Write an enzyme that holds these catalytic residues in place. Structure first.
Site, PDB file in Angstrom:
ATOM      1  N   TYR D  55      -4.030   0.836 -26.780  1.00 14.63           N
ATOM      2  CA  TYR D  55      -3.760   0.309 -25.473  1.00 14.63           C
ATOM      3  C   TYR D  55      -4.882  -0.542 -24.973  1.00 14.63           C
ATOM      4  O   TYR D  55      -6.238  -0.336 -24.962  1.00 14.63           O
ATOM      5  CB  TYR D  55      -3.845   1.705 -24.453  1.00 14.63           C
ATOM      6  CG  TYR D  55      -2.760   2.623 -24.500  1.00 14.63           C
ATOM      7  CD1 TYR D  55      -1.636   2.226 -25.164  1.00 14.63           C
ATOM      8  CD2 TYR D  55      -2.877   4.111 -24.144  1.00 14.63           C
ATOM      9  CE1 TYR D  55      -0.635   3.115 -25.278  1.00 14.63           C
ATOM     10  CE2 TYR D  55      -1.851   4.738 -24.272  1.00 14.63           C
ATOM     11  CZ  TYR D  55      -0.682   4.394 -24.742  1.00 14.63           C
ATOM     12  OH  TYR D  55       0.432   5.324 -24.994  1.00 14.63           O
ATOM     13  N   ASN D 298       2.830  11.838  -6.745  1.00 11.08           N
ATOM     14  CA  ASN D 298       3.292  12.613  -8.015  1.00 11.08           C
ATOM     15  C   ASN D 298       2.837  13.999  -8.154  1.00 11.08           C
ATOM     16  O   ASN D 298       3.672  14.870  -8.749  1.00 11.08           O
ATOM     17  CB  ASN D 298       3.001  11.414  -8.981  1.00 11.08           C
ATOM     18  CG  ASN D 298       3.666  10.166  -9.073  1.00 11.08           C
ATOM     19  OD1 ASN D 298       3.644   9.262  -9.819  1.00 11.08           O
ATOM     20  ND2 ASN D 298       4.330   9.895  -7.903  1.00 11.08           N
TER      21      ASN D 298
HETATM   22  N1  LIG Z   1       4.360   6.330 -27.693  1.00  8.29           N
HETATM   23  C1  LIG Z   1       3.882   7.360 -26.928  1.00  8.29           C
HETATM   24  O1  LIG Z   1       3.178   8.445 -27.042  1.00  8.29           O
HETATM   25  C2  LIG Z   1       3.610   6.829 -25.388  1.00  8.29           C
HETATM   26  C3  LIG Z   1       4.268   5.683 -25.166  1.00  8.29           C
HETATM   27  C4  LIG Z   1       4.046   5.032 -23.576  1.00  8.29           C
HETATM   28  C5  LIG Z   1       3.306   6.030 -22.936  1.00  8.29           C
HETATM   29  N2  LIG Z   1       2.614   7.055 -23.374  1.00  8.29           N
HETATM   30  C6  LIG Z   1       1.816   7.981 -22.120  1.00  8.29           C
HETATM   31  O2  LIG Z   1       2.587   7.975 -21.148  1.00  8.29           O
HETATM   32  C7  LIG Z   1       1.834   7.251 -19.845  1.00  8.29           C
HETATM   33  C8  LIG Z   1       2.748   6.417 -19.299  1.00  8.29           C
HETATM   34  O3  LIG Z   1       4.059   7.077 -18.793  1.00  8.29           O
HETATM   35  P1  LIG Z   1       4.376   5.374 -17.938  1.00  8.29           P
HETATM   36  O4  LIG Z   1       3.177   4.857 -17.190  1.00  8.29           O
HETATM   37  O5  LIG Z   1       4.913   4.497 -18.987  1.00  8.29           O
HETATM   38  O6  LIG Z   1       5.759   5.908 -16.989  1.00  8.29           O
HETATM   39  P2  LIG Z   1       5.279   6.571 -15.503  1.00  8.29           P
HETATM   40  O7  LIG Z   1       6.889   6.861 -15.586  1.00  8.29           O
HETATM   41  O8  LIG Z   1       4.243   7.325 -16.095  1.00  8.29           O
HETATM   42  O9  LIG Z   1       4.704   5.080 -14.992  1.00  8.29           O
HETATM   43  C9  LIG Z   1       3.970   4.773 -13.932  1.00  8.29           C
HETATM   44  C10 LIG Z   1       3.857   3.539 -13.582  1.00  8.29           C
HETATM   45  O10 LIG Z   1       4.997   3.234 -12.540  1.00  8.29           O
HETATM   46  C11 LIG Z   1       4.595   2.979 -11.177  1.00  8.29           C
HETATM   47  N3  LIG Z   1       4.771   4.290 -10.305  1.00  8.29           N
HETATM   48  C12 LIG Z   1       4.322   5.486 -10.632  1.00  8.29           C
HETATM   49  N4  LIG Z   1       4.355   6.318  -9.633  1.00  8.29           N
HETATM   50  C13 LIG Z   1       4.832   5.798  -8.734  1.00  8.29           C
HETATM   51  C14 LIG Z   1       5.203   6.015  -7.237  1.00  8.29           C
HETATM   52  N5  LIG Z   1       5.166   7.376  -6.785  1.00  8.29           N
HETATM   53  N6  LIG Z   1       5.478   5.162  -6.401  1.00  8.29           N
HETATM   54  C15 LIG Z   1       5.914   3.796  -6.960  1.00  8.29           C
HETATM   55  N7  LIG Z   1       5.482   3.528  -8.137  1.00  8.29           N
HETATM   56  C16 LIG Z   1       5.055   4.474  -8.987  1.00  8.29           C
HETATM   57  C17 LIG Z   1       3.069   2.826 -11.242  1.00  8.29           C
HETATM   58  O11 LIG Z   1       2.676   1.490 -10.588  1.00  8.29           O
HETATM   59  P3  LIG Z   1       3.379   0.129 -11.017  1.00  8.29           P
HETATM   60  O12 LIG Z   1       4.922   0.276 -11.090  1.00  8.29           O
HETATM   61  O13 LIG Z   1       2.788  -1.029 -10.338  1.00  8.29           O
HETATM   62  O14 LIG Z   1       2.951  -0.097 -12.623  1.00  8.29           O
HETATM   63  C18 LIG Z   1       2.589   3.173 -12.661  1.00  8.29           C
HETATM   64  O15 LIG Z   1       1.693   2.241 -13.008  1.00  8.29           O
HETATM   65  C19 LIG Z   1       0.668   6.638 -20.699  1.00  8.29           C
HETATM   66  O16 LIG Z   1      -0.410   6.782 -19.664  1.00  8.29           O
HETATM   67  C20 LIG Z   1       0.542   7.122 -22.060  1.00  8.29           C
HETATM   68  O17 LIG Z   1      -0.541   8.039 -22.144  1.00  8.29           O
HETATM   69  C21 LIG Z   1       2.845   7.576 -24.673  1.00  8.29           C
END
Ligand SMILES: NC(=O)c1ccc[n+]([C@@H]2O[C@H](COP(=O)([O-])OP(=O)(O)OC[C@H]3O[C@@H](n4cnc5c(N)ncnc54)[C@H](OP(=O)(O)O)[C@@H]3O)[C@@H](O)[C@H]2O)c1
Ligand SMILES: NC(=O)c1ccc[n+]([C@@H]2O[C@H](COP(=O)([O-])OP(=O)(O)OC[C@H]3O[C@@H](n4cnc5c(N)ncnc54)[C@H](OP(=O)(O)O)[C@@H]3O)[C@@H](O)[C@H]2O)c1
Lengths: 122, 326, 122, 326
Positions: D55, D298
């Site tokens: 990251y 959330n």
């Molecule tokens: N291979 C793996 O193991 C792997 C891969 C990916 C992620 N992960 C983990 O999972 C986490 C990520 O989950 P994710 O971020 O990809 O999907 P989320 O579904 O966790 O994504 C959230 C992002 O979408 C938008 N969002 C969230 N809540 C919102 C709300 N109530 N209203 C409006 N917009 C909202 C946000 O602003 P924006 O729209 O402006 O960005 C935010 O940056 C990471 O922190 C990571 O540690 C693990």
């Protein structure tokens, strides 16, 4: 005197490499043939097969030739094993004689075309 | 055609060509030249560098370590290997006992200025130490973070298999590689005995002296050149081999191989090295170089590899007349 | 070819998952049914049952159908095992024929109320 | 309704919601905002924070570590997790070999300014490294006190089971968790394949991207908003998915789910997250947030969880029309 471990559906057998090398043309005697069954994680050869039979298969190598079918193992099952381990037709035929069989000879039709046609309904 | 290969069946990825330090580092060449050689190799994608406590009495390790420290290359982008066996004149300073393996590696690491090597090798077999002690000691230095993996060198397949079964018996770590000599005039072990081990227990081969110390380069076709390894003080044995009976026969055959090289569009060294890499069982080939020109030329062996067709290999066998019986 | 270990009162058996999956409706063939016997500490399925019998149960899967009772195992004991491992009535009935039995047919009373009442004392 | 859950069947207790750092930390948001996010999460009982060497090329780990150090929170009240796989451009800086796992974790710990992480994950499967080497390496960093437990990420159940049996075979430590993607439009793995593993070998699931990167939030119902993740440089793939055919179909369905949200008295994000937590096999859900508003909203998904009755779930399945076959 490198040791060799053979695992038959969980039943563990061990012998010396030179014991199997005694019969170079069989499955367990040929490194290229047994290679397929080797498990490098457990240092053993694994066969998903009939357990009761293998005692005799191994003894065949240990005794240098004796291929006796276990009293508690069906002849059809044991024969299939003998063929799988590729003990060879010589020992198989020798096995059937002792298991009471032998024979199975007798020329076929005359071969004279018509002579071999009459020799059928007579 | 794959520049990087797994060392045997382990997850360690090495460049098909590596640079060793016997004779040269802290010995024949200067520290500036050694630095120039390593830099060229590294910049060309070579990540494998080999050394030994016995090379130049530890000076090869000191020179290699100084270059790594001076250049500041990330440790995680390098694959350093060192061999253990001859470490001193004292009775307890040689062999594969637990005492010498730990003391030897610790001293090598101090000279190399490294926390650990990626692979530590038993420079040769030890008839005087139980396999169990050796395997347990190799396992111990790996668990102590002094090495990532271990391997054998100059061991028979019987001995390598033994180290492997003793490892399974006691739940220790099996060797992942054998460092065997391999070139057009030394093929038995690598072509006949090591392939079974590679397929059966995943042990790969990291071969050394691909040019038989320079003999297969072609530089000795007409005598001992000045400044060549065979001319160096302390290498009378090499000179003798080259001028001997068998020596002339080899040079005679090298002249025949010269035609094969031209048909392939490469130099003799490039062919001799590429040849060592034709079998999948060979993970990598350790190169030797006394100057930058040789290294630049030798690295070109990788372009020849794709040209080594069945026909060409069979022709090379005809000329060599030493293909081992399987 | 994921391996599977089955421990019968201490007697260790091993086979391949695809060997058991050959018969999806049996106990060892259905993941949901065998789940109850799995030991996550030893990575094996444990059954506190009759040892002599299991050799045959496993061979049934390995041979793709052959269900022979071991000569040294009582028919009543073996049948109970067959039912426990849920080999199914088809193979059980097929098992009884070979074990010498079959038959067991013959309509009942007349069903005509009174006609089926006379057909009793005659 | 239980805020804290065991991660799989291990003794590690995690908050049903966790905060991740992909995209945001050391990337999209400022260090002050990241600090504000972590503080809100921590103060609300969230003890699970996820990151990865990959990251922002290690900057996410540096930012997370600075906050932990600055806030002075007791290390024993936090559950830090980091993933290993992609750690550099060099050939040996990626994968699950013993070399990269140890070097990767050591470097992550240095950036995080921590002695250890609670759980270290293999960011993805490695077809090039024997399972034994990987399991032994994970076990080694745990015995060295560099991690308390280890887990997998993006592994099939076959591969997870393999890691487990290899662990039993050599008396090593089995993985306790799989980090799998899970949301209303990606359900197969978590609902069909992971449950057997949870009951059979105790492996729990820690799911990521509960809102499909924001897609399931509802913010894209009518185009790519300014400052949204899909608008960010480097995330063209996300924008494409949203504007594609399948993209419009999803937004169409999100509008139908909007009615379910109102009947339940919650926002769409709160429903999408709470939905991920309905199965007992899911230990925790990793949240993503670009600002404090999103996080506060959330976290409210926890009040919705009790309302997810059989009827409601079956209705949601009708609308989604993608319930996986068992
Ligand atoms: N291979 C793996 O193991 C792997 C891969 C990916 C992620 N992960 C983990 O999972 C986490 C990520 O989950 P994710 O971020 O990809 O999907 P989320 O579904 O966790 O994504 C959230 C992002 O979408 C938008 N969002 C969230 N809540 C919102 C709300 N109530 N209203 C409006 N917009 C909202 C946000 O602003 P924006 O729209 O402006 O960005 C935010 O940056 C990471 O922190 C990571 O540690 C693990
Ligand atoms: N037991 C073991 O494990 C073991 C034993 C020995 C070596 N090794 C490894 O293998 C490496 C050595 O291989 P090697 O050096 O013995 O055989 P090479 O076949 O690796 O020997 C190369 C040497 O021969 C000459 N040479 C190389 N390329 C040439 C070219 N293109 N044109 C002209 N001359 C050329 C060089 O200059 P000069 O002729 O002037 O010297 C050079 O010093 C060492 O670095 C060591 O790490 C391992």
């Amino acid at each position: 005197s490198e040791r060799v471990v053979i695992n038959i559906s969980g039943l563990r057998f061990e012998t010396q490499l030179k014991t199997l090398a005694q019969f170079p043309e069989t499955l367990l005697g040929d490194p290229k043939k047994r290679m397929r069954y080797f498990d490098p994680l457990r240092n053993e050869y694994f066969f998903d097969r009939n357990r009761p039979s293998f005692d005799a298969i191994l003894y065949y190598y240990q005794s240098g030739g004796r291929l006796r079918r276990p009293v508690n193992v069906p002849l059809d099952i044991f024969s299939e094993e003998i063929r799988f381990y590729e003990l060879g037709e010589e020992a198989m035929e020798m096995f059937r004689e002792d298991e009471g069989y032998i024979k199975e000879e007798e020329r076929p039709l005359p071969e004279n075309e018509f002579q071999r046609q009459v020799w059928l309904l007579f | 055609l794959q520049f990087y290969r797994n060392l045997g069946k382990s997850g360690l990825r090495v460049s098909c060509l590596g640079l060793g330090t016997w004779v040269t580092f802290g010995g024949q060449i200067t520290d500036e030249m050694a630095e120039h050689l390593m830099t060229l190799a590294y910049d060309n994608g070579i990540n494998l560098f080999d050394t030994a406590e016995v090379y130049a009495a530890g000076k090869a390790e000191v020179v290699l370590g100084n270059i790594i420290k001076k250049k500041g290359w990330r440790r995680s982008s390098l694959v350093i290997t060192t061999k253990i066996f001859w470490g001193g004149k004292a009775e307890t300073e040689r062999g594969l006992s637990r005492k010498h393996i730990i003391e030897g590696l610790k001293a090598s690491l101090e000279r190399l200025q490294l926390e650990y090597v990626d692979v530590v090798f038993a420079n040769r077999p030890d008839p005087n130490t139980p396999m169990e002690e050796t395997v347990r000691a190799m396992t111990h230095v790996i668990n102590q973070g002094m090495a990532m993996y271990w391997g054998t060198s100059r061991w028979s397949s019987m001995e390598i298999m033994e180290a492997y079964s003793v490892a399974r018996q006691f739940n220790l770590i099996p060797p992942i590689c054998e460092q065997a000599e391999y070139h057009m005039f030394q093929r038995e072990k690598v072509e006949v005995q090591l392939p079974e081990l590679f397929h059966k227990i995943g042990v790969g081969a990291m071969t050394w002296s691909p040019l038989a110390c320079g003999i297969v380069s072609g530089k000795y076709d007409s005598g001992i050149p000045p400044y060549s390894r065979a001319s160096l003080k302390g290498y009378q044995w090499l000179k003798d081999k080259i001028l001997s009976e068998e020596g002339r026969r080899q040079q005679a055959k090298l002249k025949e191989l010269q035609a094969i090289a031209e048909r392939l569009g490469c130099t003799l060294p490039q062919l001799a090295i590429a040849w060592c890499l034709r079998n999948e069982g060979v993970s990598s080939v350790l190169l030797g170089a006394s100057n930058a020109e040789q290294l630049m030329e030798n690295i070109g062996a990788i372009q020849v590899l794709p040209k080594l067709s069945s026909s060409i290999v069979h022709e090379i066998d005809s000329i060599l007349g030493n293909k081992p019986y399987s």
